[PDB]
């Protein structure tokens, strides 16, 4: 908790340097909870949900071939229709909150393409003469 | 949910192309649950179990050296006694349900060997002149 959100106003490029700050903070009595068994449930539900959300994101990175990475490259080309901007307009002079608002509607298109790309890559690994 | 089980009647080879379809579907009120605290537990138990089953499989892939992969190679030889068939009898003209019935009794033998193989591989990585 030394920047949980310190990069929020930074540009997209600059904010790429705090990815471990946000990730490490996303998976952070005695008798009362059992004597009054309403609160034991209220507390467990909050804990179970934090775990399920964490795992769903990890499963996607696994499927897309980005497991274990905070920054990962793929082979899906960027469609100009998703955002008609060049790199100097995206990485500089723009925040991640603004970018998310701009992309939002295309999130599922992009995710579907990332999954298709990884499956094609695996098919090419079961053919010993691949990519030649 | 576009094929949760669509490949069930396909051959083992053909079914290898839907591994992301099955994996992505294996880790998918308000007041009622706290007013009637029987159901809060019934629901949490179902959710906790889904998480524990997921994690046990991930731990095994980790131990065997197959983390992050849907298709993974190992160095354990296949024993002819486990199934005396050639590749043209296994990958074609056979389903995964049939194969599982055929192998079942040998599941633990195979898993034990996969763990031994990875440990031997690690030992060879702490000797800078390894495999020469």
């Amino acid at each position, epitope marked *: 908790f030394l920047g949980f959100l310190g990069a929020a106003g930074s540009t997209m490029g600059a904010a790429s340097m705090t990815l471990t700050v946000q990730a490490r903070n996303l998976l952070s009595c005695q008798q009362h909870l059992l004597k009054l068994t309403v609160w034991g449930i209220k507390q467990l539900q909050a804990r179970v949900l934090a775990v399920e959300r964490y795992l769903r994101d990890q499963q996607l990175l696994g499927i897309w071939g980005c497991s274990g990475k905070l920054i990962c490259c793929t082979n899906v080309p960027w469609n100009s229709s998703w955002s008609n901007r060049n790199l100097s307009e995206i990485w500089d002079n723009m925040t991640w909150l603004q970018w998310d608002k701009e992309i939002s509607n295309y999130t599922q298109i992009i995710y579907g393409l990332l999954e298709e790309s990884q499956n094609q890559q695996e098919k090419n690994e079961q053919d*010993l*003469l*691949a990519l*030649d | 949910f576009l094929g949760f089980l669509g490949a069930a009647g396909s051959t083992m080879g053909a079914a290898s192309m839907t591994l992301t379809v099955q994996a992505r579907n294996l880790l998918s009120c308000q007041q009622h649950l706290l007013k009637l605290t029987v159901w809060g537990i019934k629901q949490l138990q179902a959710r906790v179990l889904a998480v524990e089953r997921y994690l046990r499989d991930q731990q095994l892939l980790g131990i065997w050296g197959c983390s992050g992969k849907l298709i993974c190679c190992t160095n354990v030889p296949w024993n002819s006694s486990w199934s005396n068939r050639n*590749l043209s009898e296994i990958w074609d003209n056979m389903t995964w349900l049939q194969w599982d019935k055929e192998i079942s009794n040998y599941t633990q033998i195979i898993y034990g060997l996969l763990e031994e193989s990875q440990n031997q591989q690690e030992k060879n990585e702490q000797d800078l002149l390894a495999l020469d």
Partner: antibody, heavy 120, light 105 residues
Framework: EVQLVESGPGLVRPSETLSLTCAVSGDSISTNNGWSWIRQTPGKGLEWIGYINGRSGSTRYNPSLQSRVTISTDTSGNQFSLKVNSVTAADTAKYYC?????????????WGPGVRVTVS | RMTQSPAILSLSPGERATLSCRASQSVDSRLAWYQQKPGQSPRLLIYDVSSRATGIPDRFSGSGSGTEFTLTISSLEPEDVAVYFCHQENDWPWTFGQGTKVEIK
């Protein structure tokens, strides 16, 4: 079952290029990988030249021939060919068209009769 | 690379042939053997050191690993006179041994 049929000049003069064409029957070049050329050099034996992926146009070549060899595919004719830049007497060999299938599940060859080419 | 030996195997009918092939570097198990008869394209016999190809009789077998490999032919018959080749698949360029002949009489 794939059949491989080859033709081209059996005589090339020194400093002239060499050109051989392999016709493919029974399947589509554009669908499979592993289309390749191998030659049998007298006094040496079999040597790999290179191969092409009919699905992409990507190729790989034997380093000793990277400065001279071109492999390409005719997707209309369903034939592929080998071209070698200027050749010498040292390139006299029996040249062959072959198809190599090598995957996690199957291994097989289709290997045609070849063309005898003399450089002189 | 790798080479084969004996260059010529002069064997009696019914005798077992032994043909070796030795690599200077490990090729793991990615080794195949081919049979060359006059006028024919090379025929695949054995792949991945010991696995027999479809349509090949049980008289053909083999073993080995890393750098030391052997092809054997049991109960030689006159139809088996051929030049046998050792083929390296583990890494590029793929290579062949010089080939050796098995002769029967």
């Amino acid at each position: 079952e794939v059949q491989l049929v080859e033709s081209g000049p059996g005589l090339v003069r020194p400093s002239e290029t060499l050109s051989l064409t392999c016709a493919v029957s029974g399947d589509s070049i554009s669908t499979n990988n592993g289309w390749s050329w191998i030659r049998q050099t007298p006094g040496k034996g079999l040597e790999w030249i290179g191969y092409i992926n009919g699905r992409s146009g990507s190729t790989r070549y034997n380093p000793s021939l990277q400065s001279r060899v071109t492999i390409s595919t005719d997707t209309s004719g369903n034939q592929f060919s080998l071209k070698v830049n200027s050749v010498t007497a040292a390139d006299t060999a029996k040249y062959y068209c072959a198809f190599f299938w090598s995957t996690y599940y199957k291994r097989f060859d289709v290997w045609g009769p070849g063309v005898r080419v003399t450089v002189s | 690379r790798m080479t084969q030996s004996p260059a010529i195997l002069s064997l009696s009918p019914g005798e077992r042939a032994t043909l070796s092939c030795r690599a200077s570097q490990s090729v793991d198990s990615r080794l195949a053997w081919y049979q060359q008869k006059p006028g024919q394209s090379p025929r695949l016999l054995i792949y991945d050191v010991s696995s027999r190809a479809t349509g090949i009789p049980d008289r053909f077998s083999g073993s080995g690993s890393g750098t030391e490999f052997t092809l054997t032919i049991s109960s030689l018959e006159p139809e088996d006179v051929a030049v046998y080749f050792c083929h390296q698949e583990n890494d590029w360029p793929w290579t062949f041994g010089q080939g050796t002949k098995v002769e029967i009489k």
